[model samples]
Target: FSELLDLVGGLGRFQVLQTMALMVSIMWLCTQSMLENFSAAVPSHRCWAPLLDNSTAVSTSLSPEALLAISIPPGPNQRPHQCRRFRQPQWQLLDPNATATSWSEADTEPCVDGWVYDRSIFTSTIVAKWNLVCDSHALKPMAQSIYLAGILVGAAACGPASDRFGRRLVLTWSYLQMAVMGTAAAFAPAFPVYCLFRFLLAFAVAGVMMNTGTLLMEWTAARARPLVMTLNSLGFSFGHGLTAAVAYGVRDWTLLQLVVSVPFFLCFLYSWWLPESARWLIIKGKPDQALQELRKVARINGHKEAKNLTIEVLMSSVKEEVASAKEPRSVLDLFCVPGLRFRTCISTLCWFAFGFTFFGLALDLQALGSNIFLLQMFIGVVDIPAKMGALLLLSHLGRRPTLAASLLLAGLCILANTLVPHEMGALRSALAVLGLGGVGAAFTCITIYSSELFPTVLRMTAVGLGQMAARGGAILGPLVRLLGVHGPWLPLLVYGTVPVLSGLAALLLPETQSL
Candidate 1:
């Protein structure tokens, strides 16, 4: 089967075009994943001062600072409180030379009206538009959790379905679904409706992600597969960084959503020419159709040797593959197979750990205290080298050691951030960036490693299961970060510990780089 594919030009024009299209599709997926940064951003906010807005004898005469002083009370940090304001304006306390001691005491009430958001960073975010602050602040995290939940559900369903239905058909429909749902999300009238669309958008996006990579892998030759897979990571890294620029230019959440979404229509158009996996066709007992596609590939790639390719040769190769391969298996077979059960369990754990740590750090950029646009760009740009390093390491150290080391390195870097005192923000930022790079590389490593480990027939299904576990971990990241409300380092401690254990677990998987 391998020699048959080579005759049709393994690394020629056909595979090159397929790889490019899939890589671009992957990049678009990355953009959508990171779009949450702008969409759900929580800016600094304070309760709306209704009384101050209404001009009265006392209100009109006072300066803006004095008006705020009388209408809003300071919290423990001496900053004006966000959720509460003075019940009644204490106009009598005003004096030009008044000190903090005199103005510190005031009776406060919860904001009955909407809040005032500081839109310096985000001209408008979902949080600002919907007033998802203070009491309703939990909704922001919930929205992200919902999106990840969609990915989890979609991964489980789409992976196996693609194997049965054909990658081309599944990918095309996923692209169309993503375009429709993503555009609709921009016009959502309320938070719940917006979340609903987001959930659906995530569902479609997961389909594009799961099937596209598998299609690319099956079409690529074994010698070039690692490089091709590493290049896929570059697509994500480039997209992740590019989104920061897009977000900076389009400050409005609705507009930013549209900017990222409008491109998926092009994905649907490209899908018209996208080829079905020849290997997958053979698996499904359609060697004739697979032969026709391989013939087309050979003609396009200028492989003259393919002129002699015959159906008998193809059928013989298919029969040999079938005899050697396990019987058609469902996802349940992952756990039912003897050696594979341990591999599936440990690999899924690695995916979970990496997903949690990666998104946990990605979404926490605002808390990191740098220029947000620059910080986001920095995070994305750093992944380039990390990916390049992983590609190099894959050839030398092999997949298992490279993956284990990357995860372990990321864990140590995250742990280092917990030990750094809050006052030393620069040190913490540097460590966080390093941690992100390590996990970024691990993302590429695990992706290539997982694809190599699974059998061709069950590959997409296995990848889907791993993705489901990863999305489950991603769902917890924001909620865990919420623990920072109780203690600043609690979230980091959890993030750091899980990956370290998972890194150790990665050692149990069979090495696939040399295979």
Candidate 2:
């Protein structure tokens, strides 16, 4: 019975392939996760580079002591005047923290007498600074939406590329491009410039993410796929935590970004060894080449073949089962099929829930009123174990149970946000940690299941749809903040409930453990 799976590819070999797939997935994921987390970490200030100035703030008028005595003095009620130097109140309106200030609601005020400085230039000084552009404005959200839009379009293209070109080809170049463009964005001179590069980076992010599962399944066998997929997700978790580590370890903005992007260069090290997908090669009619590649894989996995097997053997077995069947569905037919509808609906919705909640909560790290950088690092750390836990649980448990559990955990965690009183910071943060743990599980579940449920011909197509749904959630994610849903818990409230409902929907999905 165990040998049944080894016929196509052995369980051990499947484990190896899944590991490689995950390595590649982590490479791509590290960049995107780091970017989102860092954006949320950068003080959310509108003003640029606050590190170039330090001066006892200038005031138009002197203290009563200075007027009466020629110098200032300290006393109980007259304790040294804490000069709260703020940029003209006009720009201050963008600051979300000012929501409680007495002058916060004043409309169209100018900084007429307020101090102003050129923040665009750099200097050899360091001083505490505040951001001028307020978070209340729409620009940051717009930039994020546009970037995610590019991801959707990019995902649509990745499927056909893998179907026609091959996985290794597409994966390698996109990752390289992501690294280059992502590095450039980190040093962007202006917000728009930063956003533009981010847009370019998004083009391949989703495509690259989807390729992990496809590559894992293609390179592995049926029996070991579940374990491999679970581990693959754990790799994703590692990348998330890794990003936080990079950001936390390298506090300097540019250096921290380099920390995130540098691993992409390591992928080049694999170019000498990474094989083209044997399955894709065979599907594309390169039978002879497919056999050669498979033989190499067999050797790596400890299979001893008298010679490299031919496509004839692969076909020999399939000839009877599929001899009379028509060619697989095209992109259009893939979406329209009634039999495929349930899988598509459930898978795509799961992707949406996964993307929305995971990323949505990640971005909310700032809005939820925690130290963005610290929160990101802590959240990233939790994901590492969260992913590993999913791998362990899913390895023994069937796919449906693991997925159901992840969804349930995520859904329930959402309610935790509502339960905590907004004023209780400790409670809110604790609940967020729980919610993020669940999010880590959901993230892995979607990545694993989307690929398993689809046929080879339509695999990427379904994947593209599922990924598009994820990107779609990201596009709309800002709406949670836009709807005047203040308090860290409000966004969590919305993100949490939807996934529980989605998980309930997932309960109906057939397990693909043997596939």
Candidate 3:
């Protein structure tokens, strides 16, 4: 395969364009993946006082502050209550001599007339439009968890289709699905329907990334792959910042979803032109089409020796891969070999914890006590340097120490953050970001390390199992936030402690740096 790619000018114009286009699509997927941070964000809101909510004459009769002071009893931080309000306006609270007891003694009740929101940060959000606040606050994270679940199901289900049909076929459907489903979700009349559309949209999004990665790998040679992949990872970072800025610009959640989605229609426009993997064609017994594709690429790359590449050359080139593909290995094989079992187990745990902490931190940008748009960008930009340092440490310190250390550091930072006073907002934000960045470094390290840990025969199986585990962790990341009602510290504690334990477990794996 390597020799054939070389013959077809592997690093030539065709491959260059293929890689660039794939990278661009990766950025698009990134935008989709991170959209919920803003779209589902919970804005400042409080119970709508039904008594004062109606009648322009009554509203105009008393100043807004005076009306709120009487009806919307002060809660924490001297702000109006979120879920409850006084049964009747206590005009006595308006007096300067009024103390806390007067407000406390007044009768209160749950929001009987829905709620009002502070739209300064987000003019609209799913949380605002659907009123997924107070009693329904957990629904917000449920929505995100559903999306992640869709990704999980798609990851597991999408493979057989691409393996059967073709990367381009699956990817094309994925692009259109992303466009239509994403757009349809915006126009959804109800919350459950919107969630369903988002689930479908995420499933399609999962397919896009998988096919794009596979197409990129099959078209480009293995030697040049790492560089191209690094660039793609960076593209994800860029996409993160792009999502924040776009979300910042467009405050309406549905309109913002549209903004991210409509571009994929353009993706569907030209993506049909992408070449199917020649290697997949050879494996699937479509050698004629494979030969034609390679010859076309060769010609496109200035290799006029297309005639010299024939059926025999093509079959001989990909014979080993085809033979290897014929052998079937199931997930059980990962633990069948005693030497591989413990390593696989540890790798899977590390992957799970990394996914848990990273997604856990990322989904809670509002907790940072700064402008969430800026906080999201800060988190996104940190990925660049964290991954760069990971690559450096991977080569220098070897994968074992780097993997364990990155996770440990991330855990330490997260746990330490819990001790920081909330009043010191900037310091807490900085620490939390540092932990999140450490998880980024851990992600890069574990990806390369886990691949190297397994033999070629069980490598994909190992990676797949680790992926399922990671998605399992991602599914729980937001669900764990349900505990935020109990104590904000518990979620952070779980996020922090699991990674630290896994960091220690990672030490048991043998080094696989140069070997």
Query: What does the lDDT read for residue 373 in candidate 2?
Result: 54
Q: Give the range of the ten consecutive residues with the poorest summed lDDT in model 2.
A: 121-130
Candidate 3 lDDT tens digits, 1-515: 88888888879899888877777777778888788888888888878875566764434667777778788777665777788888887888888998878755438888888898887777888888889988888898899899989998988788999999999899999999999998999899999999999999989988998888888888888889998778877888888889888988898988999989998998888787777899899998989899888988887898876778888888988888888756789999888889888988899999999878877778888885576777888887888999999999999999999999999999999998889988898988888888988998998898898898988878888888987899889999999888877788888898899999999999999998665
Indicate the worst ten consecutive residues by lDDT in candidate 3: 50-59
In Å, residue 113's CA in model 2 sits off its true spot by 9.8
Better of 2 and 3 by lDDT: 3
Number of clashing residue pairs in every model?
0, 2, 0
TM-score of each: 0.89, 0.73, 0.96
> lDDT per residue, candidate 1, 1-515, as tens digits?
57877887779888888888778778778878888777888888778886566564344755788778778887765798888887777675576876556644446788887788887778888888888887777777788888888888888789568867998899999999998998999989998899999999999988988778778877778888767767776888888777887888999989989888888899899898766877778878887888888888888898788777677788777676667456566789888889789888998999999889887878867776456677778788888999889889987989999999999999999898888888897778888888889998888788778888988877866876776778889989777877877777788899899889999999988887554
lDDT of 2: 0.62
Worst lDDT run of 10 residues, candidate 1, spans: 50-59
Model 1 misplaced regions, further than 4 Å: 51-59, 92-106, 324-347, 394-401, 447-465, 504-515
At residue 499, what lDDT does model 3 achieve?
91
Count of backbone collisions in candidate 3: 0
